[PDB]
From a paper:
The enzyme, [name] (GS; EC 6.3.1.2, L-glutamate: ammonia ligase) plays a central role in cellular nitrogen assimilation by incorporating ammonium into glutamine, which serves as a carbon and nitrogen donor for the biosynthesis of nucleotides, amino acids and lipids. Here we describe a structural dissection of the archaeal [name] (Mm) GS and its regulation. Like the Gram-positive GS, the Mm GS active sites are formed at the interface between two subunits in the hexamer and are comprised of five regions; the E flap (Mm residues 303–310), the Y loop (residues 369–377), the N loop (residues 235–247), the Y179 loop (residues 152–161) and the D50 ´ loop (residues 56-71), which is the only active site region contributed from the adjacent subunit. Like other GS dodecamers, the Mm GS dodecamer is formed by two interfaces; hexamer and inter-hexamer interfaces.
Interestingly, Mm residues 165–169 are proximal to the catalytic Y179 loop, suggesting this region could impact GS active site formation. Based on these analyses, we posited that residues 167–168 might play a role in the different oligomerization properties of these GS. To test this hypothesis, we generated a Mm GS([name]-[name]) mutant and performed MP experiments on the mutant protein. The MP data for the mutant, performed at 75 nM, showed that, unlike the WT Mm GS, it displayed higher order oligomer species. However, the population of dodecamers in the GS([name]-[name]) mutant was much less than we observed in the Gram-positive GS. These data were explained by a structure of the Mm GS([name]-[name]) that we obtained at 2.45 Å resolution. The structure shows that the Mm GS([name]-[name]) subunits are similar to the apo WT Mm GS (rmsd = 0.49 Å for 432 corresponding Cα atoms). Hence, the R167A and [name] substitutions did not result in these residues adopting the structure observed in the Gram-positive GS in which the residues inserted into the adjacent subunit. However, the GS([name]-[name]) structure shows that the substitutions led to the formation of a tighter interface compared to WT GS. These analyses explain the intermediate impact on oligomerization observed for the GS([name]-[name]) mutant compared to WT Mm GS and Gram-positive GS.
Author numbering:
A (entry chain A), B (entry chain A): 5 to 447
C (entry chain B): 4 to 447
The structure:
């Protein structure tokens, strides 16, 4: 089941009776985009490319069309894990080009590719294993999503044990049937919350899978009567959903972060990589935490980190070093939530870590104390800064950042910020029922 | 009906058959406070004072009691506008003292008195006429307040014309029966919204009346089946409720703001007074706009001002000069909402205006253009700043302000900020239904 | 079924039986069953290098920070679950938890039971356990949530229920036998909709693993037939609660060391000392055998649950009972625990207490052949008959100052267990219950 050439794809389409091909790409804000191609037209698509409206990539801030061409990558062909009676369905990715023949710089996948390209200039290749947390909710009588609980279980609980036990198994099976190579799946801290850990793979292939994961899990749950939610904080008072990103660099086949003779067995480049991450994380929190609801997860008192720090012992730090060493040496960034665009988030993580190695950015001493247990003046002395407290603050930090603008390009940078600003200007004017409950009788 | 001495009060209590006396004071956050005294004990109260728990003034941030004494002011005695079958009811104010005999610096009324005291050092006395906007809503089946409309009328509409016509008349009559001397009352822009304009009077007496107004209107409406709401923005998409504060200074009986020979007929001190207001308004917006809901009114596109500016022509400026001249020359600050503590708000307005005259603070050229019609870069050149966009930003501006700390005192200053911070930390973590409507199906 | 010994045994069985997912199985400090799924393709590498996982999951709801830990899979614990999804077969597997430095994690309750077994081996003893698990079978509401709605109104040993509940009850028994549980007996219990399943009398470590497996297997099977299986100690007022009677005996040289043909009761001196140690320390770890606030709504007089510390051979209502069987079947039954307890911690502490009795020759005193429930405080005080802790707070306080429980559990488990139970009690003691409104709202 390893596809390399267009002839590999075409023969598998004929042998497996694939009738529809679905393109897969994402817009600037991480929404999954697609259109359907009948398989009869697939051979022409491989030869000539497929023309489509490129403003779909631009987000919801689009006004004008832009004719663009999608050059299909046969190595991304993959059959979807459901079987219509008519025939099989498969997804395929590709690269977006302008009519003049130049690659469209506004595709988030292209943005990730340039970061991979800059990493290869120094001989580095990046591997990532994301830990994706989500909620399994009930549908109402009309089939609409709700936040109604499907179980009351806790961390690593063997739950649910009713019919929800079968949908969770169906989700894991569907991913395995598609070649995901899941490492582990388990119940998360909050009721009805679940986590699936990806295999440690190369960043580009992993990023494509994070996108595929989201609509596969969504579709499988829907067809069983449940709703899979990737909201950061759908429920007050319980754990939010993060997307922890374990990352590692390789050069000449060996792990760049590992060093057998150092006290912590962590290399100098590992320290530099953390320094770049710590130096720039505030500038692209708006990308790792892209929606207004993201910052309801980034509040003190839960697993989510709100203070910029690193440690090898405390969990609640922004960056944590797992105990694993050798070829598996990795660092874990714990702030992102599964609403982020994986292409933009992974690219900025790579660029920030690369800038740490380039500029020999010291990360400081690790914070082994639970920072939540500290006063504001204590953190002030130790130089412990915090993440932006809402989307608007994150927007302002990203607005004036030379690092983020150069890494995304002036087109992705502008369009992402403009959409997020429109988002906040809508939210900031809403009068919420909490305000009514608090002030109607008081004032 | 003019009371001057304790014997004036005691005889009127006997003649008018007053059976209960209600003390009236406010806490640090502007909530109206009270306790009941049977009229038989009133004569002892005038002689010795009344001991009460002073931590009631401290707000909801109180932990320890503090025994304090209220020295009743017989000139504030006033009979309430409803008539129980048992007997009449009256309100009375006073000054709060510590057991050692010193005035308690934490009473907001005392804070206003010191600003009046500092104004008298330069020969100034301040007169204020507040324009109080409120909403008239329906009660549900259980008598609880709602936001259900009582009319659909607009600006200056003769509405409502149903039974709501009688409660609005009852409210105006009750205030007139109590000696308020209302200037005008009319329908406001939003449906079910109403405004009552006070007589131009001295700041201390006016501030006491703003407090009395709130619970009188509340009680009169309740007993007719309606709810009077003083929320800034109870309803999205329609006008909020402000408390415009027209103010003027007098020295030697003549209006300090008037000058017959100047082009605009406005004196130099009037310009200085505006300059101090403009220089400091950002530092005490947290007092004029004290609740989270206040900044749902301070959004662009309605009558509320969000840009720091002054003009004699445009309404939508933060400070506006009415056309009236001579003894009636006044300036109007349009940002406050009726949730503010009138003692703290008027005191800071007086101090800021006084600091303008002391330091000869130029207010700049007036902005006669509708600032809302301008780009961000246009306002940048003209030095046009904006008000804080939420309660947290207003808290931070007040936290580091030497002017506000000195004018309120270190005890009111600390307690006010601590309560408002607890307020924001509760609001910032709430997951609102708007987030569910926007992100549950998307993410 | 089959018995697996090597990793090659398990890997073969995965292929020939089309097992697609392996579920790890362990417990947190409080006894909550913990698991995560491994794809069968990953299983071969799991046997070679172990599986990294967040070991703070073992701490319970008192976990402060993450802790990387390794699970070394035990091939002999591989067992196929008794449901057959269309996708493929499912199996569970246990293992040992190791720290990154290579040492075993002392906070795993399974490790705690294993060191108790090691103390028995030092004195030449191996311990066998047969538990009797009581549970309730309730209806689900219209939304699929558990209720306390009855499924039958039968009593002790009744042939009930006889409606569709007869089938789910039989499905539970069939699936346990399908996994090789070798059930001794299953019957209706005293309370309506209450049931009992009697485990095979076998090795303590294997039996403790089966108790954890039993709970989620019964719950999942009941769930899929529209019923809820409850292991609450006392879900309903006014009827019997659910207990976990723990039969036990020691063996040495393949002989039962509790049996003596020569003595009058046909019990050896070691059995007397073993009882003495149990009676000496039972108060100090009642918080382990009866771990939740609801446990002490069962530990009240009048419903078969023992509240007084005594032993006897005749009447069951004693804390410790001697069944009539002798010879190789000689055992002593401890009747205080409920199915909410962690079996690893409860069995470990029973063993340690009994072994402490043997090594210190602790006399158990005269048996109390009368029903203690018929005695005054004066009569009970005259015979020096003590009570079990009356609520979780009292049991916590008795466990907090026990040097014995701290040594047997280890510091990590000891503090983490107590801290969690204290937070549980502090939350409970502040609640204003509807019973208080019914009694006081009108009166005061
Ligand atoms: Mg997690
Ligand atoms: Mg993690
Ligand atoms: Mg108006
Ligand atoms: Mg006005
Ligand atoms: Mg029984
Ligand atoms: Mg029994």
């Amino acid at each position: 089941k390893k596809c390399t050439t267009k002839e590999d794809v075409l023969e598998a389409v004929k042998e497996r009776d694939v009738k529809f091909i679905r393109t897969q790409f994402t817009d600037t804000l991480g929404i999954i985009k697609s259109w359907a191609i009948p398989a009869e037209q697939l051979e022409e698509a491989f030869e000539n490319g497929v023309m489509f409206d490129g403003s779909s990539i631009q987000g919801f801030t689009r006004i004008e069309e832009s004719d663009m061409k999608l050059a299909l990558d046969p190595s991304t062909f993959r059959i979807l894990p459901w079987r219509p009676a008519t025939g099989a369905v498969a997804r395929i990715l590709g690269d977006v080009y302008l009519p003049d023949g130049n690659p469209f710089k506004g595709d988030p996948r292209y943005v990730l590719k340039t970061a991979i390209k800059e990493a290869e200039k120094m001989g580095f290749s990046m591997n990532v294993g994301p830990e994706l947390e989500f909620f399994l909710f009930k549908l109402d009588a009309n089939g609409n999503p709700t936040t109604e609980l499907t179980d009351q279980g806790g961390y690593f609980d063997f739950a649910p044990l009713d019919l929800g036990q079968d949908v969770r198994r169906d989700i894991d099976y569907a991913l395995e049937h598609m070649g995901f190579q899941i490492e582990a799946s388990h119940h998360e801290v909050a009721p009805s919350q679940h986590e699936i850990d990806f295999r440690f793979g190369d960043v580009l292939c992993t990023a494509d899978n994070v996108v595929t994961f989201k609509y596969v899990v969504k579709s499988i749950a829907y067809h069983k009567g449940y709703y899979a939610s990737f909201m950061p904080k759908p429920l007050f008072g319980v754990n939010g959903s993060g997307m922890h990103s374990n990352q590692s660099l390789f050069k000449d086949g060996k792990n760049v972060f590992y060093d057998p003779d150092t006290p912590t067995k962590l290399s100098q480049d590992a320290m530099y990589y953390i320094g770049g991450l710590l130096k720039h994380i505030r500038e692209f929190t708006a990308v790792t935490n892209p929606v207004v609801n993201s910052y309801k997860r980034l509040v003190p008192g839960y697993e989510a980190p709100v203070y910029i720090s690193w440690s090898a012992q405390n969990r609640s730090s922004l960056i944590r070093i797992p105990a694993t060493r050798g070829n598996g040496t990795r660092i874990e960034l714990r702030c992102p939530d599964p609403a982020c665009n994986p292409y933009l988030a992974f690219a900025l993580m790579l660029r920030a870590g690369l800038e740490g190695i380039k500029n020999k950015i010291d990360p400081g001493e690790p914070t082994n104390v639970n920072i939540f247990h500290l006063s504001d003046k204590e953190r002030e002395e130790r130089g412990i800064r915090s993440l932006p407290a809402d989307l608007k603050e994150a927007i302002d930090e990203m607005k004036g950042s030379k690092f983020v603008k150069e890494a995304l390009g002036e087109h992705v940078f502008s369009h992402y910020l403009c959409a997020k600003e429109m988002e906040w200007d809508e939210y900031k004017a809403v009068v919420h029922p909490w305000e009514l409950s608090r002030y109607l009788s008081m004032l």
